Structure formats: C-alpha cells, structure tokens
Amino acid sequence: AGLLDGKRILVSGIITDSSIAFHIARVAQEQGAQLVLTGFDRLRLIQRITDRLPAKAPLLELDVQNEEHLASLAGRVTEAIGAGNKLDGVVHSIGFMPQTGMGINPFFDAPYADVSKGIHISAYSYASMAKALLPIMNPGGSIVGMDFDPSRAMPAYNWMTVAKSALESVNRFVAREAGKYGVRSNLVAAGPIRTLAMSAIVGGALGEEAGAQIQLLEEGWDQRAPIGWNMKDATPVAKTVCALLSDWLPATTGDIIYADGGAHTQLL
Amino acid sequence: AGLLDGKRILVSGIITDSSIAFHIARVAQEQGAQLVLTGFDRLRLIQRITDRLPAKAPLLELDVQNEEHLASLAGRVTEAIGAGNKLDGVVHSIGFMPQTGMGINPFFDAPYADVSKGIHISAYSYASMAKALLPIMNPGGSIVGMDFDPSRAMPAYNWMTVAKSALESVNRFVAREAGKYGVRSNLVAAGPIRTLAMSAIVGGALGEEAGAQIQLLEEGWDQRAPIGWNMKDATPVAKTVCALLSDWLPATTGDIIYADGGAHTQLL
Amino acid sequence: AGLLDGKRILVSGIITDSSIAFHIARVAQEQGAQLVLTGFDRLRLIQRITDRLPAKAPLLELDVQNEEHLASLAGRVTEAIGAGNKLDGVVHSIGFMPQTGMGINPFFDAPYADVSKGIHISAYSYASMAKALLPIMNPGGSIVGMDFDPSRAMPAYNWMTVAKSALESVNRFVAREAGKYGVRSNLVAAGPIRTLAMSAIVGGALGEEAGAQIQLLEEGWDQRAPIGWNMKDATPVAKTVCALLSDWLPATTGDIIYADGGAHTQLL
Amino acid sequence: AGLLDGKRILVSGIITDSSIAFHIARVAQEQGAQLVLTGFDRLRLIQRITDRLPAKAPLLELDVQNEEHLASLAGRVTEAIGAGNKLDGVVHSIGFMPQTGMGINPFFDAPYADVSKGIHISAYSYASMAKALLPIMNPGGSIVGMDFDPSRAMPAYNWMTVAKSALESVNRFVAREAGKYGVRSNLVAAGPIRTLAMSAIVGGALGEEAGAQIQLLEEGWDQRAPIGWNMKDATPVAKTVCALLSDWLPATTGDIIYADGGAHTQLL
Ligand SMILES: CCc1cc(C(=O)[C@H]2C=CN([C@@H]3O[C@H](COP(=O)(O)OP(=O)(O)OC[C@H]4O[C@@H](n5cnc6c(N)ncnc65)[C@H](O)[C@@H]4O)[C@@H](O)[C@H]3O)C=C2C(N)=O)ccn1
Ligand SMILES: CCc1cc(C(=O)[C@H]2C=CN([C@@H]3O[C@H](COP(=O)(O)OP(=O)(O)OC[C@H]4O[C@@H](n5cnc6c(N)ncnc65)[C@H](O)[C@@H]4O)[C@@H](O)[C@H]3O)C=C2C(N)=O)ccn1
Ligand SMILES: CCc1cc(C(=O)[C@H]2C=CN([C@@H]3O[C@H](COP(=O)(O)OP(=O)(O)OC[C@H]4O[C@@H](n5cnc6c(N)ncnc65)[C@H](O)[C@@H]4O)[C@@H](O)[C@H]3O)C=C2C(N)=O)ccn1
Ligand SMILES: CCc1cc(C(=O)[C@H]2C=CN([C@@H]3O[C@H](COP(=O)(O)OP(=O)(O)OC[C@H]4O[C@@H](n5cnc6c(N)ncnc65)[C@H](O)[C@@H]4O)[C@@H](O)[C@H]3O)C=C2C(N)=O)ccn1
C-alpha cells in the first residue's frame, strides 16, 4: 500500500548486501512492489544474499554480455510473474571496468579491449535491457539506471567515467524508444556509496594513489552537499529510484535525477 | 494517507483555476496534505477560486514586493496552522514581467525599471520567501519553485527568460541556507501550460508575432517529448512538485527537475 | 599587423592598471587595433592610468546606469573615430555589486535595491551597450563581455554570482539582435584574477570569513586547471578576448569561452 | 607570417577534398604552418587529393585501430619533420560508425561489435593519438578534435552521437595528461557540413527516413544560428580549429568550442 503498491519490478545488480541494488530492492518491497531479480554469475551467493530481503523474489540469471541470456530474458520473466502479466518497472544497476581502466594504471595505458568490455557492461547494456524488456512492460512503466555525474574529469575513475558519459547519452536514446510503449527512461546520479568494491579501492585495492584520491573525493562530497552526504547509507538513493518507478514523476524521461545531496550544484 | 499525509504545506501562486499553483494545491490535498495559501492582490477572487479545492485552506495575503507582508508572513502562517506547528513544505509558483519585457516589444527596448520589477517578483522573491519561512519549517522540509528551462535563448519570452536564469541561480544559493535547517530547495521546469495568461498571449495579447512564435513553440514540445506533452493538462506538473515535497527525493537539493515530457533531452 | 590589425575597438572597464580591461586594451593595441576607451566616474584617474598603454586612445565617459550617457554614446564614439568609420569590436568589462550582496553579509540580508543595482550594472548593461553600439558596428564585428562560471553556487560571491547567471542569459539574447548586423556576441569566463578589489577582499575587506573562502577558492583553481592558473597574470585572459575580437572565431556567438586554465572541466 | 607562423602541425582525417580535415590543412598552411598529414587506408587517393593543398606535406599512414601504426607513429613523424624538432599541434578529425549504428536501422538493433568499432575509431582514438604524440610535442602545444554537440538525443545519428558523448569525456581526461607537457586539449563542435558521406546520407544512402530527418536538421540549423549557418562551407570551422592551434587561447583546455553559428545557444 506504498509508493509502488501493485507494481511488478525487475531489479538487476545485486551482488552483496552492500550493493545499491540490494537497497533498491528492499525499499521497493517495503513499498508494496513485487520483484523479479537478476544476477550475474554467482547466483548461489546472490540467492543467499537476497533471502534477507523483506519478501521473496525469483532470481533469474543474466550476463549482460550474453546474447542468449537477453534473448530469453523476457520469456523467463513472464514465466516468473505468470503469463498475462507485464512489468511496470526495470532497474539497471550494473557497472564494471577492468582494473586497467581505473586506478593508478595511467589513462593512456588502458587497452581498448578492456575499455570496450567496460562500456559494453556499463553503458550498452542499458540499451540491451530496454530492448529485451520493453515488449513486456505496461504503459506508464519506468526504466531507471544507476549513474554518477561524469560532466567533469576526475582522478582514478578514468574510463569508468567515460562509460558513464556514454550511458547518459544512451539513456536519452532509450527514452525515444521507451516512449513508444508509454514508458519513461531515467538515470539516477548518486553520490559515492561505500559498497564492498568501493571500500576495497579506498583501502588501496587498485593502488595507493587511487585510494587516496577517491578518499578525499568522498570527503569533499559531504562538505559540498548543502544537506550533507553519508557514504555508508544507500537508503536516500534507493528512495529516489523508487520515486522514479512510481507515478509521481510522469513527465520526466531521458533525464537524470541527482541523489547526491546537492553536491553537484555547488563549487564548494 | 497519500504522498503528503500529515504534511503542512504553504502554496502561493493561485490566481485562476488554470494556474499551475491551483493544480499543485489540488493534488497536494488529494494526497493528504494540509495547506495554507497565499494570494497576491485580488483575494476576493482567489478566495472564490479556492473554494473549489477538495478541502478548505486559509488564505493569507502576500505581495512579494511588500516588505511588511514578508516580515509578518511567518507570524500569520503560525497563527493559521496554530502555534507549536511548523511547515513541511513551501511552493513558490509566482512570476511576472511587464509587457515591455516580453512579446513583440524588442529586447533592447525594455527599460530597466520594468526588467527589475520582473526579476524582483520572478527571481528574488524565491529568496525572500525562503528567508521568511525557513524559521518555521521542519527538518526534512522542502521548498519548490516553478521554472522553465532558460539555458538557451528563444523568441518572445525575452527578459522573463533572463529572470528564470537568475531564479535557477538563486535556488542554488537558497539550498545552501535551507540545508542548515535540514530543508531541501528545488525547482521544477515545466513544459508550456495553457494558463489564462498564456492563452491570451497565444491569442495575440502581446502582439501577433509573439503569439505566433509561442504557438509553434508549444507544438514543437509535444513532438520532441519522447512521452509527448499536453499543454492543457497541468496535472503531470502538479505531481512532480508533490514528489519533491514528499520524502522520496531526500538527497536532491539546489537542483532542477524537468517535468516537460523529456522535451529538453532531445534536439528534435 | 597583428590579430586585430585595422580593427577599431571600444574597450570599457578600465579603472586601475590591474583591471582585466587594462590588459585587454594593452594586448589589443599590441596586435594593431585602434581603441576608444570608456570610463565610469573617475576619468582623471582613468586618463592617468591609460597614458601607460602602448599607444594613445580617446577616453569617453560612460556611466552604464545613465540613460543620457548611453543615448549619446554612439554619437561621441563616431566623433572620436571620425565620421564614416564604424567599430569592429566592443569589450564589456564592467561589474559591480554593493557590499551587501557579497561577502559575510548573509545571502538573505541583501535588500533588493542593492541586488537590483548590481544586476543593472553587471548584466543589463551588456544589453544596453549592445543597443547603443550595434548601429555603429561593421558586419563581422564582435561584442565580448567578462564573466565567471556561475553554473554552481559558491560561498562569498552570493548575488554577484546570480548577476553572472543573468548576464550569460542576456548574452544569448544579445546574440540574436547582433546577428542582424552580422555581429557576434560572446562572453569570456575567466579564472580568478588579483585585481585591486579582489586583493582587498582576500585581505578581509568584506569580512574575514569571506576573505578566507575566496582565498582557498583561488588555490583550488590552479590545482584543478590541467594547465594551471596564475591569478596574478591577466594576460592569458586578455588574449582570449582578442581571439574573440578577431576573425578566427567566425562561427561562434551567444556563447561562452572559458579562459580559466580548464578548471571547470575537472571535479578536482 | 600568419596565425600559425612557425608551427609544425600534424593533421589527420583527410579523405576527399570535402573533408573538414582538408579545409583545416588548407587554412593552416595559408597561415604559415608546416604540416604532416596522416591517412587511413587509401593513401594513393589521399596523396592525390592533398597535392591540391597550397604547399606540400608528407603523408603518413595511420589506421587508428592498428597498434603498430600508433607505436611507430611518433618515430615516423620525427623522421618527417627531422630529428630535433617537435610538433606544436595535432588535429584529430576522424570518425566512423558502421551503417548498423546509424540511419533507419533501429537503435536497439546495433550489435555491440559494430558500436564498439565506432567508439574505438571515433572516441578512444583521441586518447590513442595523444598518447603517441605527446612525447614529441612542445610546451604550448595544442591538440584538437572534431566533435558535434551530443548533449541531446536526435534521430538518425544514434550511436555516432553516443560516441561523441564518449569523445567529449575522453577529451577532459586527455587534457589532464596533456597538461603535464604544457599542452592543451580541446574539441570543436561544428554545425553540419556537407561532406561526401553527409551528402550521400541526405540523398538516402542509409534509408529514406534517415535522409529526411538529417535534412530538416540542417535546415533548422541556419534558422537557429543567430549568424546563420552554411552547410556547404567548412571554412568557418577550419578557422576555429586554427584559433585553438594558435597561442591566442592559452588558458582553455579540456574544453569544447562551438563553431555552429551559435545554433546550440538557441531553442529556436
Ligand atoms: C567522483 C566520482 C563519483 C563516483 C560515484 C559512484 O561510483 C556511485 C555512482 C553510481 N554507482 C552505480 O551503481 C550501479 C551498481 O554499483 P554498486 O555500487 O552497487 O556496486 P556492486 O558491485 O555492488 O553491484 C553492481 C553489479 O555489477 C554487476 N556485473 C558486472 N558485469 C555484469 C554483467 N555483465 N551482467 C550482469 N551484472 C554484472 C555485478 O554482478 C553487480 O551486481 C552501477 O551502475 C554503478 O556505477 C555506484 C556508486 C558507488 N559509490 O558505489 C558517485 C559520485 N562520484
Ligand atoms: C519556450 C519557453 C518556455 C516557457 C515555459 C513556461 O512559461 C511554464 C513554465 C513555468 N511557469 C511558472 O509557473 C509559475 C506560475 O505561473 P502560471 O503559469 O500558473 O500563471 P499564473 O499567472 O496563473 O499564476 C502565478 C502568480 O503570479 C503571481 N503574481 C504576480 N506578482 C506577484 C507578487 N508580486 N506577489 C505574489 N504573487 C504575484 C499572481 O498573483 C499569480 O498567482 C511561474 O513562476 C511561472 O513562470 C509557467 C509556465 C506556463 N506555460 O504557463 C515552459 C517551457 N518553455
Ligand atoms: C569562484 C567565483 C569566481 C570568480 C571569478 C571572477 O570574479 C573573475 C571573473 C570575471 N571578472 C569580470 O571582469 C570584469 C572586470 O572586472 P575586474 O576584475 O577588472 O575589476 P575592476 O574593478 O578593475 O574593473 C571593472 C569596472 O567596473 C566598473 N564600474 C562600476 N559601475 C560601473 C558603471 N556603472 N558604469 C561603468 N563602469 C562601472 C568600474 O568603473 C571598473 O572599470 C567584470 O565583469 C568582472 O566580474 C573578474 C574576475 C576577477 N577575479 O577579478 C572567476 C572564477 N570564479
Ligand atoms: C544533428 C547532429 C549533428 C551532426 C554534426 C556533424 O556530424 C559534423 C560534426 C563533426 N564532424 C566530425 O569531423 C570529423 C571528420 O569528419 P568529416 O565530416 O570530414 O568526414 P570525412 O569522412 O571526410 O573524414 C574523416 C576521416 O574518417 C576517417 N577514418 C575512419 N576510420 C579511420 C581509422 N580507423 N583511422 C584513421 N582514419 C579513419 C577517414 O579516413 C576520414 O579521413 C569527425 O570526427 C566527424 O564526426 C563532421 C560533421 C559533418 N556534418 O560532416 C554537427 C551538428 N549536429
């Protein structure tokens, strides 16, 4: 009986209990939505992590680089929610860039094969998922993806940043197609969140310099954000995604909503 | 028991039953909010128009250019909602520019006294209202103002456009102050809506050329908007404002949410 | 025989030998341009300061808030460059905001009369000058104004920032009119330069907090700028203005060129 | 004795006498620069086309997707300009996207292998070229690439647009590295130019719908541009690139200069 009461939503991107996607799924269910999850390759793990969600939800395997996974995607989803039913929302919360495209490894030293894999998973997959799922979405539906403001360069993030720039551009095009189905397509630019991977990197997983740079980046965030920013709490981001999945933002598409504490609206 | 259940919200800007503000108030009340309205100078009229709202709400006079109105504002609002209570939201939906700053009258022919009056009411008042109301707002509160994308020049709108550019900049600063009170400050950029004034202008109220230019502007909107745009329906805009007044966009401030059908994300 | 060889250019904004305008005039003359200067109210001083320029140039009084000054402006300029001749360029390098609109004085405490005076001189005057001068400009001409990136809020600058937001918007409209005369209109966003006033402020002229905030702002600039930034050297900015006055940027108008060392293209 | 007198500049991208690059090379030489050209795979043709340039210039083969070409690039360039000498400028004017990523072929039907090839040549190569050439560039040097505003979606261009979004982001990062060598990195966003390929497409080479869409896009350009736009004349674009290669835009890097007639600063 909440924001998403009666909505059927597919949520990808869960890998650990610290994933933004995990918190997206929790808030969504708390708000009355029925979910259908998708996981990359460690499904046994994802399954075990997802049992902790408020309610149960079927888990479907989905390797965004696998054409067969995508081709059969809509089929398996309908099977999970039952024939005759369609999705009202889709959450894209996946991203990746080989170590070579981030951290201390110099920007120029990233081989195209690695950058291409990063863009395939981080940006193109947004279009892939929409393509596979639009056929089984209801008018008024909503697709949303996770993003971070790449309008300016920054240290460490390197090619992952370039992948976001590409993603934002793909979103604007996905909106054109999604509009034919009465569906909206938007992105959510979050502030930095301490997921497992992020912590590992801050801890020096990808080099000391990278870790040091990303650390004072997080610190400058809470300082710039007029309402502050708590990197250990992904709830404010999960709510924003749910706001976009609801019926309360019916006139916005091909857009980006910033859930970063307002940090990007301030020089300092 | 809706989006704004239990929220006390002040809504300015109602002048006719076609005002964006009127539709903001309606949706807000339908969602369980208690309102406190403010009107410019024709209160008898505003009063008569507002009786048509779902529920009743006290109407307070407020001339945004009157220092006394603003000085006593918070006092009269507390009186209306009762001592001990505070506002959880504030909607700024006022705007104005003398005929000389819009339409066929050439851009260069607008005397500064007129432009200054337009900016005083359309942009500075956003800061004025926040100043007067922040002292009586609850943490988690939300201030929202009506806006239109002025990132690019356009015919007819002339100085009103310049006033919006100023407004967007004031919003970013209001967010800095509002943040000290745990309050967010955002703007909503709407697509063109056929209010009384807009219709009059399209009908040639400010010259034939102006009317003709604004008319094909509205037409290009629905064409560019991936989800289309209905200029006669302000409901999609009212909902977006309510989304910002709710607790579902807790990490965004000093920002702009586009409720324009996605028209600004497309070249054509 | 340089960049502006044979060009007649009017340059406003000189007040001391540290003014951006002073350096604009110097580089322009070094590049073969004939100038016509305008000064605010201390002409004896301006005159004495300008004698130091490479070559001599007539000085005309111009109070941007004085309608008579503007009305007779074109007349006096033609007299100075001789009947039959027209200007090929115009440099707007003036700006002002009462103490109340900047520094430690809280944002909300700036009375509209002060903000309005600041916007009149800092933004509207851009339109005023174009209006008066376009009638006496040659096709291929170029108008340029001084600006600073106000796309994000920042401490201390307060309303002066809002005035720039307005200026950028006015520039886009001035371009529409200037285009009818075959003339371009652009702005140059400079990094912080240590003019007399800026130094005074950094020294605490408008409060200690303001001075401290602006000081670490300048420091963060050179750090973010991929090519660095030297606040004591206005030459890089003067050259950029001359680039816009030349014939080498013939397809850009209603635009903004950033001469800030590239600081705005980087988060850090 | 012109803008680039004494400058050694490498210019890639020439394929026909209608290529933007061809006009870049012409204006550059007319302004006193010594060039070193690079061509893709039809060197016999490029050679024959380039004989028509004002002066002669060595042509080096360069397949941006060939690691060997890039690895030996700097070596062959030094050989061409003679040991002891370095480049003062580099022009990246290459772009490509398989038919499947543009035109009538639906956005969702573009296989990643094709999109990846387009991004490799259109965006990543900007970084590749900088990497290979920075070691042999002089302080004060300048790298510039051709671009088109992809901030908004548009019909027909599809993935090529996404590739530009990526390119703009890569440019901001290239600037960080180039800055270490005292070198600037900028992009030039041009209005539509009737190159051979563009004409072919307008003529229906990639489908009738695509051709029709791109045709009214070009038409809307001249209408929006305050100074107009001539799609058959690439000279205004060539000059802008030369402006960036000169010493008159010393404080701008990681940026984008719009040589589009000012079309992007206007809604209509
Ligand atoms: C200064 C620069 C900056 C950076 C940020 C951020 O990085 C911030 C913004 C977006 N995001 C995005 O949020 C999404 C989820 O990431 P999380 O942080 O939750 O991390 P997780 O690693 O927990 O989860 C995401 C998913 O990646 C998935 N994976 C990889 N390849 C595939 C594939 N091929 N198919 C299917 N799944 C795959 C994986 O299985 C996993 O479930 C991504 O799109 C992110 O980029 C995360 C942020 C953070 N801080 O952790 C914010 C502000 N400024
Ligand atoms: C191509 C350019 C463009 C324009 C738009 C728009 O103009 C669109 C966007 C914002 N708005 C904003 O919405 C707000 C409300 O305007 P409405 O359209 O409802 O019109 P209304 O005239 O109905 O209502 C607004 C209020 O102005 C108030 N008024 C004037 N002076 C004062 C004062 N001094 N003190 C108190 N009240 C005063 C007046 O009393 C009235 O209630 C304003 O801030 C508008 O600019 C309206 C739009 C429209 N189409 O009608 C959208 C996209 N592109
Ligand atoms: C973090 C915020 C920020 C700020 C900046 C800047 O402030 C920077 C950018 C633009 N500018 C602009 O450059 C122009 C010239 O300012 P200067 O710095 O040279 O200062 P000056 O005070 O030397 O000169 C400008 C003129 O103001 C003129 N004046 C006032 N009123 C009038 C009037 N009514 N009629 C005629 N003249 C009048 C006055 O006579 C004087 O000649 C203005 O438009 C400025 O805002 C200056 C900067 C600086 N650092 O000094 C850059 C980056 N980030
Ligand atoms: C509404 C959308 C839109 C589009 C535009 C434009 O497309 C406009 C903007 C940039 N450009 C860019 O200008 C550059 C040059 O393109 P031209 O138009 O001259 O076309 P050309 O085809 O003449 O030349 C470019 C080069 O591509 C080169 N090529 C392909 N692969 C490789 C490779 N692997 N290695 C080396 N060379 C290769 C090829 O050899 C050729 O010399 C590119 O980066 C373009 O995208 C061209 C425009 C136009 N109208 O022709 C402008 C505004 N709005």
Place of tokens 């088109």: D148
d(CA C137, CA C8): 9
CB contact under 8 A, C169 and B153: yes
A positions 170-229 inside 8 Å of C (CB) = 216-217, 220
Q: What is the rounded distance in angstroms from the CA atom of residue A51 to the CA atom of residue A47?
A: 6
**Which residues, judged by CB distance below 6 Å to any ligand atom, belong to the binding site of ligand 4?**
B 267; D 13-16, 19-21, 40, 62-65, 93-96, 121, 146-148, 154, 157, 190-193, 195, 197-198, 217
In chain C, where the domains are located: 1-268
Tokens 């309510």 — which residue? B242
Helix (H) or strand (E) holding D145: strand D137-147
D104 is in an annotated binding site: no
C-alpha distances in angstroms, A223 versus A169, B172, C104, C161? Answer: 29, 15, 19, 20
Q: Which of B14, B17, B19, B149 to mutate to test the pocket of ligand 2 (most atoms within 8 A of CB)?
A: B19
D238 in C contact zone (CB under 8 Å): no
B190 is written with which tokens?
């709407």
| Way the structure was solved | X-ray
Q: Which residues are CB-neighbours of C123 under 8 A, at least 6 positions away?
A: B162, C163, C164, C166, C167, C170
Q: Which residues pair with C258 in a beta bridge?
A: C189
Q: What are phi and psi of C181, to 5 degrees?
A: -100, 10
Closest CA to C250 of D231, D260, D232: D260
Fold of the domain built from segment(s) A1-268: Rossmann fold (3.40.50)
Is D265 within 8 Å of B153 when comparing Cβ atoms? yes
Q: Which helix (H) or strand (E) holds D216?
A: helix D208-224
Residue C124 near residue C95 (C-beta atoms within 8 A): no
Task: Give the list of residues 6+ apart from residue C198 with CB closer than 8 angstroms, or none.
Answer: C192, C214
Checking DSSP bridges between strand A255-259 and strand A184-190, what pairing results, if any?
parallel
- DSSP lists the bridge partners of residue C189 as C147, C258
Q: What is the DSSP string of C97-113?
A: --GGGSTTS-GGG--HH
Q: How far is CA C163 from the centre of its chain?
A: 13
Residue D229 · residue D261 · CB < 8 Å: yes
- Six-digit token string for C252: 């850009």
C124 vs D15: CA distance, rounded Å: 48
Name the nearest CA neighbour of D249 among D142, D115, D117, D145.
D142
- Give B110-113's long-range contacts (Cβ < 8 A, gap of 24+): B110/B158, B110/B159, B112/C120, B112/C124
**Reported resolution in A?**
2.2
Query: Which among D14, D18, D19 is the best mutation to test ligand 4's pocket, defined by most ligand atoms within 8 Å of the CB?
Result: D19
b (16+ CB within 10 A) / e for C207-226: beebbebbbebbebbbebbb
Q: Which SS3 state, helix, strand or coil, does residue C64 take?
A: coil
State whether the beta carbon of C15 lies less than 6 angstroms from ligand 3.
yes
